[PDB]
Amino acid sequence: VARAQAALAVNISAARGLQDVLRTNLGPKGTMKMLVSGAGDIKLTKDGNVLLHEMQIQHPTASLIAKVATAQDDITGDGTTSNVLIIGELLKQADLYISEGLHPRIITEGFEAAKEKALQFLEEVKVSREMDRETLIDVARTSLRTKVHAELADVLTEAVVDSILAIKKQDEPIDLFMIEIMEMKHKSETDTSLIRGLVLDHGARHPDMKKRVEDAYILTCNVSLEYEKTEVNSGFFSAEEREKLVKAERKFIEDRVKKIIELKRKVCGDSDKGFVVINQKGIDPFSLDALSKEGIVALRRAKRRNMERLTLACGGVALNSFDDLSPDCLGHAGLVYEYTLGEEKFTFIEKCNNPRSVTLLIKGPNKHTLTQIKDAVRDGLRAVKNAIDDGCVVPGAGAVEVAMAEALIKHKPSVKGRAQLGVQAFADALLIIPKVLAQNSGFDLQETLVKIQAEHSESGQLVGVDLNTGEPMVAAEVGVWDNYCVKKQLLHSCTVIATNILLVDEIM
Amino acid sequence: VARAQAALAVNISAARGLQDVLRTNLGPKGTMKMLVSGAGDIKLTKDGNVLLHEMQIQHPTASLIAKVATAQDDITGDGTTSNVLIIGELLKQADLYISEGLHPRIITEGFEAAKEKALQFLEEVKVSREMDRETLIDVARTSLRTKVHAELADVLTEAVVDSILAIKKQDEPIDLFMIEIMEMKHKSETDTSLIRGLVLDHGARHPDMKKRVEDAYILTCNVSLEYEEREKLVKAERKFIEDRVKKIIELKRKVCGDSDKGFVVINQKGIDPFSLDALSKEGIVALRRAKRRNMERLTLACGGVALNSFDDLSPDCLGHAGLVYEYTLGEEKFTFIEKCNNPRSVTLLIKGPNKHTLTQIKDAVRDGLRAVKNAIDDGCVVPGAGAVEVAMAEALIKHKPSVKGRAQLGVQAFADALLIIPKVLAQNSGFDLQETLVKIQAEHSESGQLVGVDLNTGEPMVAAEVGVWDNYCVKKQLLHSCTVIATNILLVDEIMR
Amino acid sequence: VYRNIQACKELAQTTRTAYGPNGMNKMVINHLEKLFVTNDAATILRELEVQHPAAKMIVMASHMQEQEVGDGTNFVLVFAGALLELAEELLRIGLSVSEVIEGYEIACRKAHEILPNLVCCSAKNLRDIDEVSSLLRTSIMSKQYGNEVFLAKLIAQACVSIFPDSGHFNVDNIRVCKILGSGISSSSVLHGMVFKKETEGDVTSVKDAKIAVYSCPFAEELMNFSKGEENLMDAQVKAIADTGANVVVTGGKVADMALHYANKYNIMLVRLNSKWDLRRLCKTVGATALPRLTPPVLEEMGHCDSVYLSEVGDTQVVVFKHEKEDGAISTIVLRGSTDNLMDDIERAVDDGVNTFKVLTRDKRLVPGGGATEIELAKQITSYGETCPGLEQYAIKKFAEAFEAIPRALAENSGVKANEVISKLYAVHQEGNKNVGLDIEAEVPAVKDMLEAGILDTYLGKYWAIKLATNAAVTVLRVDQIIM
Amino acid sequence: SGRKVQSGNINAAKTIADIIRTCLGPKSMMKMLLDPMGGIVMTNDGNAILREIQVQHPAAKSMIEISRTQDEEVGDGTTSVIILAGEMLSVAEHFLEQQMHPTVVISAYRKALDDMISTLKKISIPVDISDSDMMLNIINSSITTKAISRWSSLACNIALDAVKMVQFEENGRKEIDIKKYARVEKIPGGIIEDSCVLRGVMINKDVTHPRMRRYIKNPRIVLLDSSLEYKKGIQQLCEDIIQLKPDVVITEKGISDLAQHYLMRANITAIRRVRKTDNNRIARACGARIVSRPEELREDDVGTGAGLLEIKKIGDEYFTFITDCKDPKACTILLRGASKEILSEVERNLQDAMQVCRNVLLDPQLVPGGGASEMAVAHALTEKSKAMTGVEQWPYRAVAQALEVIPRTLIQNCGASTIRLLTSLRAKHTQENCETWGVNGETGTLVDMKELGIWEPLAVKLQTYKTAVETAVLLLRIDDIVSGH
Numbered sequence A: 001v002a003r004a005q006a007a008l009a010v011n012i013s014a015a016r017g018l019q020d021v022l023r024t025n026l027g028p029k030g031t032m033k034m035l036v037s038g039a040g041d042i043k044l045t046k047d048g049n050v051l052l053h054e055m056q057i058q059h060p061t062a063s064l065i066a067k068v069a070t071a072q073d074d075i076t077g078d079g080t081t082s083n084v085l086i087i088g089e090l091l092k093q094a095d096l097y098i099s100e101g102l103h104p105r106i107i108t109e110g111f112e113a114a115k116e117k118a119l120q121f122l123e124e125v126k127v128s129r130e131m132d133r134e135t136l137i138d139v140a141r142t143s144l145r146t147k148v149h150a151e152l153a154d155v156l157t158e159a160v161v162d163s164i165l166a167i168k169k170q171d172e173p174i175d176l177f178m179i180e181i182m183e184m185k186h187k188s189e190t191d192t193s194l195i196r197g198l199v200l201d202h203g204a205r206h207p208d209m210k211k212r213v214e215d216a217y218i219l220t221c222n223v224s225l226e227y228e229k230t231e232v233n234s235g236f237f238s239a240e241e242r243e244k245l246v247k248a249e250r251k252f253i254e255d256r257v258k259k260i261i262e263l264k265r266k267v268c269g270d271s272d273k274g275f276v277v278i279n280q281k282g283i284d285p286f287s288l289d290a291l292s293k294e295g296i297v298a299l300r301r302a303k304r305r306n307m308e309r310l311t312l313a314c315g316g317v318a319l320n321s322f323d324d325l326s327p328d329c330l331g332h333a334g335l336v337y338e339y340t341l342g343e344e345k346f347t348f349i350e351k352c353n354n355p356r357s358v359t360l361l362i363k364g365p366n367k368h369t370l371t372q373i374k375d376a377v378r379d380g381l382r383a384v385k386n387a388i389d390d391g392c393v394v395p396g397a398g399a400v401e402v403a404m405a406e407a408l409i410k411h412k413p414s415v416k417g418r419a420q421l422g423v424q425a426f427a428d429a430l431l432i433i434p435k436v437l438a439q440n441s442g443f444d445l446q447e448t449l450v451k452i453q454a455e456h457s458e459s460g461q462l463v464g465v466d467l468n469t470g471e472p473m474v475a476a477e478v479g480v481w482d483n484y485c486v487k488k489q490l491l492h493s494c495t496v497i498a499t500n501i502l503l504v505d506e507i508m
Numbered sequence B: 001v002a003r004a005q006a007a008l009a010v011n012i013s014a015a016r017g018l019q020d021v022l023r024t025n026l027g028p029k030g031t032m033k034m035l036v037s038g039a040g041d042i043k044l045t046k047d048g049n050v051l052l053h054e055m056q057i058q059h060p061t062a063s064l065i066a067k068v069a070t071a072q073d074d075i076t077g078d079g080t081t082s083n084v085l086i087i088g089e090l091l092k093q094a095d096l097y098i099s100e101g102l103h104p105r106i107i108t109e110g111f112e113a114a115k116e117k118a119l120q121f122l123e124e125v126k127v128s129r130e131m132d133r134e135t136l137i138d139v140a141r142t143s144l145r146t147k148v149h150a151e152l153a154d155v156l157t158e159a160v161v162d163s164i165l166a167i168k169k170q171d172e173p174i175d176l177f178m179i180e181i182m183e184m185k186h187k188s189e190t191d192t193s194l195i196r197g198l199v200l201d202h203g204a205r206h207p208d209m210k211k212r213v214e215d216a217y218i219l220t221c222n223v224s225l226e227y228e229e230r231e232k233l234v235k236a237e238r239k240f241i242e243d244r245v246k247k248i249i250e251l252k253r254k255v256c257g258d259s260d261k262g263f264v265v266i267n268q269k270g271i272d273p274f275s276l277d278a279l280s281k282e283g284i285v286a287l288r289r290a291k292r293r294n295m296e297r298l299t300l301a302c303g304g305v306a307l308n309s310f311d312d313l314s315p316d317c318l319g320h321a322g323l324v325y326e327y328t329l330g331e332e333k334f335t336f337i338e339k340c341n342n343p344r345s346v347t348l349l350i351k352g353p354n355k356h357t358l359t360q361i362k363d364a365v366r367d368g369l370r371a372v373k374n375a376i377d378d379g380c381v382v383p384g385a386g387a388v389e390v391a392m393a394e395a396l397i398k399h400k401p402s403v404k405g406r407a408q409l410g411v412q413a414f415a416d417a418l419l420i421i422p423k424v425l426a427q428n429s430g431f432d433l434q435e436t437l438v439k440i441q442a443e444h445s446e447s448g449q450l451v452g453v454d455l456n457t458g459e460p461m462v463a464a465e466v467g468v469w470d471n472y473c474v475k476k477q478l479l480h481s482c483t484v485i486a487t488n489i490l491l492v493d494e495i496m497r
Numbered sequence C: 001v002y003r004n005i006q007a008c009k010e011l012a013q014t015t016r017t018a019y020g021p022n023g024m025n026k027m028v029i030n031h032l033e034k035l036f037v038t039n040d041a042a043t044i045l046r047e048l049e050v051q052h053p054a055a056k057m058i059v060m061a062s063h064m065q066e067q068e069v070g071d072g073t074n075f076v077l078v079f080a081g082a083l084l085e086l087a088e089e090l091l092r093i094g095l096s097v098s099e100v101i102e103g104y105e106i107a108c109r110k111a112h113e114i115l116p117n118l119v120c121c122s123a124k125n126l127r128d129i130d131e132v133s134s135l136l137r138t139s140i141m142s143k144q145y146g147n148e149v150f151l152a153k154l155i156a157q158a159c160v161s162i163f164p165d166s167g168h169f170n171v172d173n174i175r176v177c178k179i180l181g182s183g184i185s186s187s188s189v190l191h192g193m194v195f196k197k198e199t200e201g202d203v204t205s206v207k208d209a210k211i212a213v214y215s216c217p218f219a220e221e222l223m224n225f226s227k228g229e230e231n232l233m234d235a236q237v238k239a240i241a242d243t244g245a246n247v248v249v250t251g252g253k254v255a256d257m258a259l260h261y262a263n264k265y266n267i268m269l270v271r272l273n274s275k276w277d278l279r280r281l282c283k284t285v286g287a288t289a290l291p292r293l294t295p296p297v298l299e300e301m302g303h304c305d306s307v308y309l310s311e312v313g314d315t316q317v318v319v320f321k322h323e324k325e326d327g328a329i330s331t332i333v334l335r336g337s338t339d340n341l342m343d344d345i346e347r348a349v350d351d352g353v354n355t356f357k358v359l360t361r362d363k364r365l366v367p368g369g370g371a372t373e374i375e376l377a378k379q380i381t382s383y384g385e386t387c388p389g390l391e392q393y394a395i396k397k398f399a400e401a402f403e404a405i406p407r408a409l410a411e412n413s414g415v416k417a418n419e420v421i422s423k424l425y426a427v428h429q430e431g432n433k434n435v436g437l438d439i440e441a442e443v444p445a446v447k448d449m450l451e452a453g454i455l456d457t458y459l460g461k462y463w464a465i466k467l468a469t470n471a472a473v474t475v476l477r478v479d480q481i482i483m
Numbered sequence D: 001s002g003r004k005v006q007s008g009n010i011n012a013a014k015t016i017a018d019i020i021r022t023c024l025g026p027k028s029m030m031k032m033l034l035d036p037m038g039g040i041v042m043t044n045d046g047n048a049i050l051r052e053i054q055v056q057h058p059a060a061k062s063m064i065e066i067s068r069t070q071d072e073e074v075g076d077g078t079t080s081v082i083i084l085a086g087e088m089l090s091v092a093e094h095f096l097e098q099q100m101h102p103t104v105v106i107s108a109y110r111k112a113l114d115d116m117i118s119t120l121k122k123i124s125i126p127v128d129i130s131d132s133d134m135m136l137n138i139i140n141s142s143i144t145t146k147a148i149s150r151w152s153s154l155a156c157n158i159a160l161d162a163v164k165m166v167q168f169e170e171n172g173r174k175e176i177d178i179k180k181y182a183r184v185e186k187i188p189g190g191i192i193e194d195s196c197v198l199r200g201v202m203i204n205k206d207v208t209h210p211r212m213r214r215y216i217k218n219p220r221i222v223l224l225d226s227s228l229e230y231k232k233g234i235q236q237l238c239e240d241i242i243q244l245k246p247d248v249v250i251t252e253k254g255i256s257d258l259a260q261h262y263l264m265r266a267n268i269t270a271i272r273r274v275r276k277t278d279n280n281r282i283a284r285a286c287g288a289r290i291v292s293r294p295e296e297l298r299e300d301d302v303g304t305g306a307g308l309l310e311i312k313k314i315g316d317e318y319f320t321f322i323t324d325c326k327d328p329k330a331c332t333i334l335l336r337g338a339s340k341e342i343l344s345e346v347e348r349n350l351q352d353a354m355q356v357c358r359n360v361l362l363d364p365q366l367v368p369g370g371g372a373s374e375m376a377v378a379h380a381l382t383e384k385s386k387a388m389t390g391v392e393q394w395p396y397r398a399v400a401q402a403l404e405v406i407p408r409t410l411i412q413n414c415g416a417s418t419i420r421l422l423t424s425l426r427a428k429h430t431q432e433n434c435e436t437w438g439v440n441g442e443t444g445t446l447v448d449m450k451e452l453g454i455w456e457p458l459a460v461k462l463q464t465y466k467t468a469v470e471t472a473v474l475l476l477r478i479d480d481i482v483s484g485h
């Protein structure tokens, strides 16, 4: 039977080797992990989501455990750190019994019993919270706390929740519809702002270009309008041959800006109707002030994320060629103004015909701060979306794990009895999350646990670690919470993963 | 801090080694070990007592856990295998928390915080049984089942208990003073007998020597009586034998008077054949080469006043025995002295076909009647077969974190370290190590029910009504010793050289 | 973890010796075999093969420090190495890796508000040439030799004081035309874009000129090919000379019939342009790059105002000046014997003028040379015992790291560091803020830094103590990469 | 060499200091001692670990040797000197790595020693002289957590009678107390309560056939070291003894019964084959004198000593008691029982307590221990470090925090963490100057040691601090160990 011992030993070794790493990852007092991949690139990463993708993985079975943890990550966003480590201690508690001589199928049956005996506790430990703004604010605060410094989480927990209040269509929630995230290197970090509209990449270049255009329709284009010294040899291989050739290109822009004048004499016979133009490529240096003498905002260097949000939110009908300069190919933008801050210009399009697409504009002094706060923002809005579609929101910070372990050890030998060791091996491996949460913040792993392992009411009390003191703290009145499906799919997937790994003997 | 981890690792390894050595030898279904000397001598051994002595030790620290263990064996008689394995598992339960990163003083405190409540549970789980014959019988049966077969335990459970009823005095119960182990290599193992008096080494070498001596008055002597310029030299030694026979006839006509007053004599050396006939022509039993363990039992039980020479053949230098008969069995004879004047020293006559299995049953008888001597000296009796140990786990797990709190981990370590007795009892008896444990760990009453393991079915069996019992001064002394031994090995540092 | 901060310690140690005005210069024989005997930390950091990834955060923080004040790089490296060196003592005491982070953060936030409370700022303006020449003394005093700074502060300032105008400034306009030959005393000042030329046919007092733009430099059948090439280069220099150019530029060498053509139409035959002025001359006169001799027009043309020949620096050179700013470009001409000192003089010039740029927007000047550092080292260690808890350790390990900065100033000057640190810390208790470490005395003697004039920018220290602490914190919060 | 082997000296000192660092305090972790034969010893007392250890390095040999000199003058604390020297020598290398000389380091250490000796006297609480409640509290402080805890009810009396029976009023009032003159007789048999005190010296020997005018109500002693004979054919010098007429003359050699009678003819009683520890205490209890030269044989021959000789068979043994003596400085303490392992510990800890009550006869001061005196001198020396300038400022402060391992090891080997406990201890010690709080050795909690009661005497901790500092400066005084390899 040493054959099965070989596979059991190598799987135990791999799932310890991941368990220690992802134990160090978890927690708001956790440490970042820096990943270098060949070209000397530096990525400061705390979340296990990017860590399980980009890791040049040492071990064969660890690749499978990382792939299935990513398959769990597809629905939860975070908690996957806790997912793969609760696996790596679940089969550790199994290894405590297969070394005693038990069959692995006994421990799989115990996991199967304890899965239902934990989910029956999970369905009643929750509370069907109404979707008040503050009951989402504290969820955003908890999901933002484990990523960045906690005061920055208290800053951006207002900018997350109103962006999530801007989604209110009860047919389908998706974050990739409307939340666009851009960055401003203002050498400041606390001013990540939600703007109810499309924030563009840049702004009005000319000084005589108008700072303020209220009732704006938009001329979109993609192809060139600049005085284009072409990227092939513009001086082509006398002098008169090109004296009017690129000047014929100039005239091709002269009658074009005459056509632009014609289009703004189609609708803009009144001056209250202002206008903005955007080309995705460059603006001609004489058309720059030629529209600045007309007072129409012009801009280059647009991204396609800006174009698709001009079409979807601003109602902009897209344009490719200049033959169709017609009033139906416009949009609607009741607030267009450039906003130069730091060193770069930035136009803001808002008050569009259907305000749906928003912008969580990130202020950041360095690149790693803004990427960490971007992952913080995205995981927070994902967690609060998972708190939206779940009608209930469970307490957090390890309270439900202690209460579930206090449920499962009170689950008697009503179970098979031979499979009682499976229940007792499932229960103690639930306590590792309040173990390593208090452990990651300098407190005692054992003393804080046994302080929480004294149920502070007649019930197994919803009491988690405090990440600043290491004291038994009720997570209800502090609102340190999380949604339901994170730990639900956590327990389900981790049970099926453990019963998958526990039944392997020989590999070739 | 790496030195402490290194010293603890090289100690937990050695106390695991002693645990794996003396695990399988505990229980009635256990396996013997083969003590092999340097001269190829073979010894088969079940009990860890002399196993711990002659073990050619392989590890330095492993000697120390040996040295205290037989120190328990002076004051417990049997079950030092249980002591060394509960030490080796208490150490592993502490290692499961020290390797987590806990200081060993915390588990040291949690050892005593559970040990005092373990003694509190032990002083109330016992029953203060009176010294009935049957409770001593089942104590002897329990102590003998783990050494010999249960049928052979049913053989010895009367021959032990009657001798321990024969040590019953006012206030001197004593094993070595009056109970000896006589062995006859004769064809049947079921024939160990209690003898009220003494068995001497040989018997009558002559048919004219009688076999019935009523008023036996025993004479000791050390110098042989045998036939031991040269035709008259050895003849002069022969004449020293001759007047020796004449002095024998002097005592034969000096102390006799009537024919009721019998005379008997042993010698620590040889008796001459013509002198054998001269003692046989008056029917007085002579004996060559009785043992020196028989001399003090002739004094203390048979009342035999010792003598060496023949000039002082006196009436007052004799014993008073009511029965002397020689007994040929197998090949050799044995003189039987019974109805002694102050008959205190008794004789356990072990019969059997072999020698080394007869030394095995001799050590079995020794361990069993020392256990029942402890059961008499204790004013109570306790359940056995791991019933009280499961009750101790049921105590100390439920004995709350009202203790220090971080030492409650040490309390639970002591609690689940007290469960390796029924675990290896079920393991040695071929059942499951966990199934019948949690079957026993389903308390049949609302209290922690005194449920031992059945060593024949794997059944949770109440040990109270079956009398599978032990004395108090075994588990009380293991609770007293094991805790402080394990915490002596916990608080160690590294090694000089 | 300890290997990361050990890599940070050796990264601090390789630049600690090059700190201050007596920095020991290092030799760079690089990948493409240069030869630099140099002292600036950003030059060595851009040459060193920084292979360990944890030190790359320190290098990037020093690069961000360079990107906004131009100086204070070695200060960031020394202070971050000191913070991590005391952080490993804090960790081996028994503090967590979390506690040192917020301890360093609290003490850095305390330093950020104590630092504006020790300032002896600039007097009235970045004009008044002789006043701000003394203000620019400390920057090149740190970099180049001190006895050389007395001319060099004037030469670096009288050119940069041309346009401190209307609240805006650019450092790119201050250039260097590196001309070899005579000594450093022979260096002088020029007003406009200057480089050497070859020929002589220059129209001098031009109007808003018409500048040629180059992005790329240069029996009877044989005679017929000769006349064909003759009229070929004639039509080529006419293709520049049509639309009325005054100069004809080239990055390369002369041509004989072409120079006779440039004398025939009276055009200045400009030659020998660098591989860096091809953008810079286009920037100053409004020129657009043209490859060949045929494709200029009037629209494809630059516009200077006055192109003639100057002989300052004992060599014939060009002048381009009077642009839209009318005094935008103002190069300097730096004269040396060899090049291996001239790169250090050049890298001292721009590191003086970026301090001039930060003096345009920050007039606050702190006393430098141990004065500010020992003051912060006293203030934060007096704050350290006030707040109890574990942070009482870390704050007290913060200010002690500040004492590593004058120690690096001490041991680079042949001075016993413990004696001068104890003496400076004692005299700072009563003989307050403006005293610091003297350089010239072999004896460990202190000296007041205000009357010595050795003062630094306040914003440079303010950004440097932010970026070094951010680098130390973001290094301390990693564990490893599989490597 | 030089500072390299000076760092080698202090490394050999620290590696023998941090071996036996853990085994101070009432929760001392044990150690494993293994000869190269397989024998296993488990120990707690640091001096027993110091005995059988070998060390190749001579600096550590001298370091252990001076603590061995400390071991037999007041008693224990020999581990604490080795411990406290080690961290001072360890923090000395941080300034030896600053390229400063050992001289400035040891002068800062001596300047810190001069503050250590004074600030301990500042926090010294006076105990009262010979008051039985506090004299019992000396036994509760310095004798407890030993194996006297079931027999301290005898030791509290055996302390106080012996300290009043070993005094010496040489230059003043009874000031020198001594460990060697309290006539200890540790013979088993009987119950342990039979151990009682008496004034005088007891003698295990008697004359082999005691037919002698033996016991006199004022025995005046002359000592002799020769052997007595039959007569002149020494009875001649025995006849010369009769000029002054003492009533005993003490020899060490055997006297026949006829020579016993000829000693009766002068009426002087001798003794044979006695011990030296019997002889010096016989001389100490009585103040006798020795002379045999005839021109020196004058009125200055006879030492008028005791008031009772007594042949006595206490426990069928040939006892002779010299009691009701001249000097109450060699007085009898019998020690009875079954075995000889705990009353020996009584004798050890009560000779250490005899030096304690000797300090009580000099300066009856008890200072809160358990690191409370250590934290007090640490804070009082850090505040004194703040005003001083010069290069000696850092080493002077260094022993301010090098010496605080006496709480720090004690908070180590009790399960609790050291960082937050020491931080909270100094947190209520710097601004709370007048408290003197010590870490409790049981639960690892910062208690008031004055409320806990465990007060170490002043002079013993002064001796340990002084010996630690003169260990450190002696080790830093060494430059090289060159006389060979």
Ligand SMILES: Nc1ncnc2c1ncn2[C@@H]1O[C@H](COP(=O)(O)OP(=O)(O)O)[C@@H](O)[C@H]1O
Pocket: C019, C020, C021, C040, C041, C070, C071, C072, C073, C074, C075, C138, C141, C142, C143, C351, C368, C369, C370, C437, C438, C439, C454, C455, C456
């Ligand atoms: N002559 C001097 N006397 C005292 N201090 C000086 C002197 N020269 C330079 N320093 C100090 O050296 C410090 C470091 O400057 P440095 O790091 O060399 O500048 P950079 O970062 O541009 O190389 C400055 O803060 C300055 O106070």
